[PDB]
């Protein structure tokens, strides 16, 4: 099951980052590739697959790492990064 099918494609996710705040220390490409799209306020994003949302990004944050840290069971996460990556993150 996919929470948000209109956001399945990387291209559609990138579009939502049109008004991504430049003050935020994480680039839209990286968020889009990790399955996130912009909800439209501040720095809130959601995964099109698991629907997990993240906010308050900090300098050095890695979208895939945070994805695996907070939502280790996302099917998109597992499909893109592999179970070993997830387990490895969880093991920190």
């Amino acid at each position: 099951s996919i929470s948000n099918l209109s956001m399945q494609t990387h291209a559609a996710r990138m579009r939502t980052f049109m008004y991504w705040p430049s003050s935020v220390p994480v680039q839209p490409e990286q968020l889009a590739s990790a399955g996130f799209y912009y909800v439209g306020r501040n720095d809130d994003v959601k995964c099109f697959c698991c629907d997990g949302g993240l906010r308050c990004w900090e300098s050095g944050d890695d979208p895939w790492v945070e994805h695996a840290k907070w939502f280790p069971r996302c099917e998109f996460l597992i499909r893109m990064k592999g179970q070993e990556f997830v387990d490895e993150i969880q093991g920190r």
């Binding site: 959601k46 997990g52 949302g53 993240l54 906010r55 308050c56 990004w57 900090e58 945070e66 907070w70």
Partner: peptide, 6 residues
Amino acid sequence: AVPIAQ
């Protein structure tokens, strides 16, 4: 980052 509370 942190989860958006639901």
